[PDB]
Amino acid sequence: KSTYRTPNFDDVLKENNDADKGRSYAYFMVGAMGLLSSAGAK
Amino acid sequence: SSLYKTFFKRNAVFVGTIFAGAFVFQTVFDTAITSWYENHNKGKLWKDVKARIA
Amino acid sequence: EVTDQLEDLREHFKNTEEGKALVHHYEECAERVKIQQQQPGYADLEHKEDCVEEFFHLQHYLDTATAPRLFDKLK
Amino acid sequence: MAFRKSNVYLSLVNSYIIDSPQPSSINYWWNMGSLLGLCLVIQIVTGIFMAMHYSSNIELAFSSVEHIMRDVHNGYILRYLHANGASFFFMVMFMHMAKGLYYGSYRSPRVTLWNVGVIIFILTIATAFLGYCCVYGQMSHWGATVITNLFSAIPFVGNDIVSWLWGGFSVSNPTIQRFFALHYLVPFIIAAMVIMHLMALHIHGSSNPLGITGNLDRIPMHSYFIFKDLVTVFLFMLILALFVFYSPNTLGHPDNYIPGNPLVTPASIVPEWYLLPFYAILRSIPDKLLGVITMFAAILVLLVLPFTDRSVVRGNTFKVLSKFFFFIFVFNFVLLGQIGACHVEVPYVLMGQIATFIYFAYFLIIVPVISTIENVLFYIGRVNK
Amino acid sequence: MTAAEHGLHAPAYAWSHNGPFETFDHASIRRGYQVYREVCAACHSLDRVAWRTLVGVSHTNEEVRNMAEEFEYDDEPDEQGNPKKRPGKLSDYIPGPYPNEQAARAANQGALPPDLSLIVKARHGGCDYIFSLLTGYPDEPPAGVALPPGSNYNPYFPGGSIAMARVLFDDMVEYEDGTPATTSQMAKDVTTFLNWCAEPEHDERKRLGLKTVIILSSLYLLSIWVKKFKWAGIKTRKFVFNPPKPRK
Amino acid sequence: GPPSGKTYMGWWGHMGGPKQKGITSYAVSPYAQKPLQGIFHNAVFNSFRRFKSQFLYVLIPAGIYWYWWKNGNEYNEFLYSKAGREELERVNV
Numbered sequence: 001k002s003t004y005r006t007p008n009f010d011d012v013l014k015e016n017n018d019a020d021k022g023r024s025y026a027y028f029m030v031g032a033m034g035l036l037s038s039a040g041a042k
Numbered sequence: 043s044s045l046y047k048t049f050f051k052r053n054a055v056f057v058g059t060i061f062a063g064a065f066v067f068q069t070v071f072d073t074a075i076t077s078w079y080e081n082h083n084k085g086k087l088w089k090d091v092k093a094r095i096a
Numbered sequence: 097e098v099t100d101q102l103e104d105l106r107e108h109f110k111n112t113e114e115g116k117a118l119v120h121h122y123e124e125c126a127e128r129v130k131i132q133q134q135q136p137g138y139a140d141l142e143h144k145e146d147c148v149e150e151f152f153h154l155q156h157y158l159d160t161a162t163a164p165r166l167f168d169k170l171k
Numbered sequence: 172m173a174f175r176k177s178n179v180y181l182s183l184v185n186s187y188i189i190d191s192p193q194p195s196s197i198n199y200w201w202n203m204g205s206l207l208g209l210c211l212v213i214q215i216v217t218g219i220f221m222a223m224h225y226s227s228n229i230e231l232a233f234s235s236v237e238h239i240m241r242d243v244h245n246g247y248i249l250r251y252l253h254a255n256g257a258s259f260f261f262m263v264m265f266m267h268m269a270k271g272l273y274y275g276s277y278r279s280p281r282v283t284l285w286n287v288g289v290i291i292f293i294l295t296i297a298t299a300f301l302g303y304c305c306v307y308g309q310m311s312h313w314g315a316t317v318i319t320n321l322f323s324a325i326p327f328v329g330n331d332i333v334s335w336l337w338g339g340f341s342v343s344n345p346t347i348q349r350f351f352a353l354h355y356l357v358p359f360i361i362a363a364m365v366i367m368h369l370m371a372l373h374i375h376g377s378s379n380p381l382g383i384t385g386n387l388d389r390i391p392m393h394s395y396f397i398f399k400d401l402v403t404v405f406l407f408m409l410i411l412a413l414f415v416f417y418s419p420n421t422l423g424h425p426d427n428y429i430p431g432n433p434l435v436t437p438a439s440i441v442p443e444w445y446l447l448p449f450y451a452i453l454r455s456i457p458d459k460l461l462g463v464i465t466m467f468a469a470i471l472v473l474l475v476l477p478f479t480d481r482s483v484v485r486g487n488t489f490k491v492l493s494k495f496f497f498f499i500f501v502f503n504f505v506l507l508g509q510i511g512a513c514h515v516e517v518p519y520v521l522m523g524q525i526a527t528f529i530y531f532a533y534f535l536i537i538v539p540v541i542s543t544i545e546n547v548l549f550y551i552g553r554v555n556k
Numbered sequence: 557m558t559a560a561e562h563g564l565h566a567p568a569y570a571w572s573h574n575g576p577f578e579t580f581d582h583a584s585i586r587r588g589y590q591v592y593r594e595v596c597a598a599c600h601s602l603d604r605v606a607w608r609t610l611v612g613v614s615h616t617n618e619e620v621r622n623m624a625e626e627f628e629y630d631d632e633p634d635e636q637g638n639p640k641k642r643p644g645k646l647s648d649y650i651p652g653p654y655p656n657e658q659a660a661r662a663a664n665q666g667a668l669p670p671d672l673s674l675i676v677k678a679r680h681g682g683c684d685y686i687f688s689l690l691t692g693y694p695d696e697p698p699a700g701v702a703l704p705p706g707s708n709y710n711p712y713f714p715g716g717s718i719a720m721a722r723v724l725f726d727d728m729v730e731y732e733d734g735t736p737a738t739t740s741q742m743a744k745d746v747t748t749f750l751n752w753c754a755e756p757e758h759d760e761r762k763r764l765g766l767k768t769v770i771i772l773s774s775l776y777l778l779s780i781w782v783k784k785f786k787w788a789g790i791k792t793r794k795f796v797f798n799p800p801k802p803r804k
Numbered sequence: 805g806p807p808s809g810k811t812y813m814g815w816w817g818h819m820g821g822p823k824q825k826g827i828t829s830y831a832v833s834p835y836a837q838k839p840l841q842g843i844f845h846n847a848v849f850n851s852f853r854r855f856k857s858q859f860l861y862v863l864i865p866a867g868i869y870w871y872w873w874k875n876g877n878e879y880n881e882f883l884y885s886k887a888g889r890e891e892l893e894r895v896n897v
């Protein structure tokens with residue numbers, strides 16, 4: 001098996017990448033954690 | 043989601059959004075939780091007793 | 097003429113058959129101790145038989161019964 | 172190079188919490204160290220902000236604690252965080268030392284790390300005892316009395332040592348004042364020992380739950396174990412918030428809200444919950460001097476541990492009998508705590524003696540014999556002749 | 557020990573302030589203060605409860621002021637150094653009936669009545685213990701128990717022999733709101749009042765506990781998401797190995 | 805600064821493991837990766853596997869010591885009762 005044949009990631013990849021959707025969802029969740037951390041630190 | 047990155051692109055407006063969100067969240071969460079904690083204990087607080095005493 | 101709630105519940109749960117058998121054991125113990133305390137030499141023995149444990153069984157049954165109902169029947 | 176690498180101060184922050192090469196297979200049991208650091212910061216900050224309102228006279232100690240819990244704004248938060256966080260500090264430290272015994276982190280080349288850990292453990296027991304005596308309740312006064320009379324057991328010298336500790340003739344005003352000064356002092360020694368602990372760790376890196384090297388697949392500290400420790404930090408704060416706000420006085424003993432009375436002895440004198448195995452070890456020996464020696468030997472027998480583990484593989488992960496006898500040991504330690512919480516009654520004396528013997532037999536007989544048998548069993552299982 | 561020295565186990569009464577959301581019953585605290593003042597306060601100090609803590613909790617402002625002005629405290633002395641008294645104010649503490657310990661032991665057959673500021677937090681069982689202590693006196697002790705003279709029996713006290721008298725009888729006080737004041741009613745009221753006296757922070761403690769548990773549970777779930785997010789490059793990582801050419 | 809002794813962990817570049825060759829890695833960005841796709845079916849079946857392989861080493865010592873504690877506590881509350889007071893007399897002396 002060559003080193004150019006990438007193994008199977010297809011069970012764990014997104015069916016649609018859409019690089020603003022995924023980054024917006026991730027930054028929304030990180031921002032929610034930062035929101036509640038700011039409230040708790042206050 | 044959508045194409046709006048005026049909230050997530052720049053870290054200044056992102057951390058300003060997080061601070062404004064927490065500034066609203068403190069007030070809203072405190073008022074809501076005080077209203078629920080007094081609604082769950084209707085009749086036991088001193089407000090109800092002072093309103094009961096003529 | 098509103099009597100106390102707790103003795104009402106205590107008499108009501110002394111009147112059940114477990115309460116009747118348990119006060120039967122307790123009154124039997126009390127009669128044992130009452131006939132113990134007339135023979136001479138009772139002032140000078142090694143120990144004394146008492147009904148602390150039968151009274152503990154009776155009192156534990158009664159308040160295990162009457163604990164969840166009492167504050168319902170109170171203001 | 173980068174500024175986090177070229178600066179003198181940020182190079183330590185880099186090489187400890189940013190670019191530290193961690194083994195990429197470590198589970199959540201390698202998180203109790205960060206959790207103990209957070210809980211130590213909690214203890215120190217609440218200790219300062221609560222010791223701004225504390226007067227350490229013997230006639231004014233208990234009244235000042237109640238002044239904190241009543242008159243100081245949010246003072247109940249401070250005291251309840253402080254006492255229940257000391258309980259969680261010992262619980263996370265017990266879990267951390269159990270992680271040390273299980274995965275074989277005591278073995279070479281990490282003997283210095285294990286010895287500095289045992290020194291931190293002794294200093295933390297000392298800090299908790301001094302701070303519990305600073306409350307000056309009923310249990311505080313009588314526990315201080317019993318522990319210092321245990322120090323009076325020392326032959327030919329001990330009575331003068333105890334009159335030196337007390338600063339008088341019984342547990343009085345100089346005793347409580349010097350316990351407050353020492354109790355303010357010893358956590359900074361604990362912080363210095365923690366920094367020495369991190370140095371002795373950093374010269375070889377963490378272990379891994381397999382017991383093989385981790386030099387092949389290292390991942391950095393930053394974002395990976397930062398957010399994994401953030402997960403357990405939020406879980407720890409959640410459980411601490413439960414036991415502070417909803418049920419604060421569960422872990423404590425209710426006799427500690429009686430003021431300190433030297434005339435009335437309690438019906439059952441018991442330390443706070445985590446010193447009970449050591450109190451059971453000491454109470455199981457029918458002698459005062461041998462009792463004190465056995466109580467300190469029950470911690471020094473952790474120092475004699477890397478020299479008795481004769482297993483050639485690191486850690487109890489892939490070994491059957493060592494894992495079984497490890498959980499025998501853990502539930503024996505819990506049984507020591509529960510024996511110590513009881514009275515000096517039949518059959519708790521005999522069970523305390525058997526439980527102390529199984530403690531010392533695990534540290535001195537069971538580990539080398541089971542490790543030797545497991546080595547020979549691994550050999551003859553796969554070698555044919 | 558036997559069960560006699562340990563004392564009988566007080567059962568689980570369903571108080572109106574158990575549970576992680578229920579607060580105190582402040583009308584019950586008001587009636588508990590009335591039963592305190594008319595029964596207990598002949599023989600129990602309450603040394604750690606100031607008058608100002610009752611304002612807005614169980615009584616109004618003028619009620620606490622006109623209850624505190626019935627008592628006399630030590631004023632600063634006059635211009636000739638003579639000691640003088642003054643009526644009470646809001647900043648003083650609730651005074652005990654006894655000037656010192658020896659007067660207490662003289663007036664109560666040697667036994668010292670303990671200060672009740674923390675008595676529901678300094679006994680195992682707590683509220684249930686105090687209620688079962690008050691409503692637990694038998695009409696006569698069980699057969700075979702020789703009480704020392706001057707002492708009384710109830711099984712909930714550790715040892716059986718207590719030096720208290722049965723001091724809750726039917727309708728010895730009158731309530732302001734017209735509640736039927738039986739023994740169990742008064743005992744429930746004073747046990748709620750002593751729970752207030754030991755734990756005046758109880759209401760605010762439970763609501764700040766609600767806020768803190770909600771915020772930390774949300775933070776814990778958000779942090780689980782971010783840990784599963786930033787480790788996704790490492791959980792799904794794969795390794796294949798074709799063994800190299802052995803000539804080198 | 806002075807040199808130090810031989811450690812068993814170097815740094816990024818000279819870590820000190822064995823030389824490795826022909827072993828290739830493959831990883832995908834987490835922005836194009838869906839997190840927590842493996843919580844359902846995972847927290848059931850993998851958690852049951854992790855419990856089945858690993859529970860009995862915890863359950864047998866807990867069973868032994870809990871049975872021994874329960875037998876001891878039952879014998880305590882026996883011999884400090886009225887029934888076993890003569891046995892308390894003969895084993896306490």
Ligand SMILES: CCCCCCCCCCC(=O)OC[C@H](COP(=O)(O)OC[C@H](O)COP(=O)(O)OC[C@@H](COC(=O)CC)OC(=O)CCC)OC(=O)CCCCCCCC
Pocket residue numbers: 198199200259262263402403406407410780784
């Ligand atoms: C008592 C007061 C202490 C206060 C300290 C607060 C912190 C408590 C720490 C407890 C602990 O560290 O145990 C870790 C133990 C081993 O972990 P592992 O790496 O082998 O499992 C990998 C996981 O599937 C990865 O899954 P993942 O990493 O994606 O998420 C892990 C989990 C976080 O939970 C925890 O950290 C422990 C509760 O996220 C969840 O999905 C939670 C769902 C509600 O976790 C377990 O999996 C449980 C195994 C039995 C342990 C019982 C403990 C009894 C003492």
Ligand SMILES: CCCCCCCCCCCCCCCCCC(=O)OC[C@H](COP(=O)(O)OCCN)OC(=O)CCCCCCCCCCCCC
Pocket residue numbers: 200265266268269270273380473487488489501504505858861862
């Ligand atoms: C003086 C010296 C101090 C001594 C301290 C004494 C012990 C203090 C008690 C603290 C509790 C800590 C428990 C032990 C912590 C280590 C356990 C552990 O490492 O978990 C992993 C273990 C096996 O997992 P593996 O790593 O082998 O998996 C590899 C996959 N092939 O997984 C397991 O086997 C299950 C782990 C379940 C933990 C059970 C904890 C029981 C806690 C006591 C309960 C008390 C109430 C009865």
Ligand code: HEC
Pocket residue numbers: 211214215217218219221222225236250253254257258260295298299300302303304305306354355358361423
């Ligand atoms: C001033 C700094 C200070 C530090 C640092 C500190 N404490 Fe304390 N601690 C106190 C004070 C003051 C008290 C007594 C007041 C109280 O108990 O609320 C106390 C009390 C205690 C108590 C008894 C709590 C109670 O009410 O029963 C324990 C247990 C304790 N400390 C443990 C620790 C541990 C463990 C550490 C750190 C490793 C620590 N303390 C660090 C100030 C401190």
Ligand code: HEC
Pocket residue numbers: 200201202203204205207208211264267268271274275276277284285288289291292361365368372376377378379
């Ligand atoms: C008696 C044992 C012991 C005690 C007590 C102890 N440590 Fe450790 N600590 C260790 C060992 C062993 C390791 C490394 C184990 C391994 O990596 O396999 C360690 C590792 C650590 C780590 C690295 C992360 C980790 O989990 O390995 C930190 C951080 C740490 N300790 C901090 C502390 C702090 C803070 C305290 C309390 C003040 C403390 N330790 C008490 C033995 C101990």
Ligand code: HEC
Pocket residue numbers: 591592595596597598599600664667668669670675686689713714718719720721723746
């Ligand atoms: C006759 C005087 C007297 C009155 C009136 C009185 N007490 Fe007592 N009480 C005592 C004495 C004396 C003790 C001490 C008992 C002992 O030390 O054995 C005591 C002890 C107590 C105790 C602690 C018992 C223990 O074992 O710890 C409580 C609780 C208590 N009283 C509640 C009350 C309450 C509530 C009232 C008001 C209803 C009250 N008492 C009124 C004399 C009194």
Ligand SMILES: COc1c(O)c(C)c(C/C=C(\C)CC/C=C(\C)CC/C=C(\C)CC/C=C(\C)CC/C=C(/C)CCC=C(C)C)c(O)c1OC
Pocket residue numbers: 187188191204205206207208209211212215216219220362365366369372396400
């Ligand atoms: C192995 O990899 C590591 C690792 O290398 C490290 C370092 C850590 C982190 C561990 C720690 C940070 C633990 C070390 C703890 C300390 C050094 C304790 C330090 C705390 C103090 C010195 C006390 C704090 C003191 C203050 C904050 C002073 C300010 C306080 C007050 C009260 C001033 C207020 C007064 C006024 C007037 C406002 C890890 O968790 C870790 O695993 C990921």
Ligand SMILES: CCCCCCCCCCCCCCC(=O)OCCCOP(=O)(O)OC[C@@H](O)COP(=O)(O)OCCCOC(C)=O
Pocket residue numbers: 183184187188205366369370373397400805
């Ligand atoms: C996960 C938690 C996140 C929360 C964020 C807060 C965490 C903060 C943790 C900061 C940790 C810093 C403390 C570590 C420390 O003090 O160790 C210094 C030891 C340096 O010696 P070395 O490791 O051999 O380094 C290599 C040195 O030999 C280089 O020689 P030289 O340049 O002289 O350096 C010696 C420093 C002397 O200072 C000390 C204290 O030792």
Ligand SMILES: CCCCCCCCCCCCCCC(=O)O[C@H](COC(=O)CCCCCCCCCCCC)COP(=O)(O)O
Pocket residue numbers: 030033034037205206208209212394397400401404
């Ligand atoms: C000295 C005390 C030791 C306590 C041990 C605490 C161990 C965990 C510390 C967590 C620090 C998180 C910083 C991560 C970071 O900056 O990443 C930064 C940005 O990440 C974030 O913004 C995280 C969101 C905000 C989280 C705030 C958490 C505050 C609550 C802390 C509670 C404990 C004090 C870099 O992230 P990136 O490299 O992936 O881009």
Ligand SMILES: CCCCCCCCCCCCCCCCCC(=O)O[C@H](COC(=O)CCCCCC)COP(=O)(O)OCCN
Pocket residue numbers: 177178179180181183184
């Ligand atoms: C509890 C700590 C025990 C001892 C362990 C030591 C570890 C300390 C960790 C401190 C981490 C945070 C320090 C950040 C400071 C970095 C700023 C800096 O280095 O800039 C420095 C200047 O620093 C200062 O002036 C003030 C430093 C005061 C720090 C007091 C906290 C820039 O200097 P530079 O490295 O570029 O050298 C060029 C020479 N002209």
Ligand SMILES: CCCCCCCCCCCCCC(=O)O[C@H](COC(=O)CCCCCCCCCCC)COP(=O)(O)O
Pocket residue numbers: 037039040041042212213216248408409411412764767768769771772
């Ligand atoms: C300095 C170390 C202190 C760490 C405390 C952790 C223990 C958890 C219990 C905290 C309860 C005390 C706070 C409180 O009562 O707030 C209560 C609200 O609960 C919280 O938000 C606590 C969330 C904790 C988040 C931790 C963030 C990390 C901050 C690091 C320091 C900058 C009261 O809120 P309020 O006074 O009404 O604004």
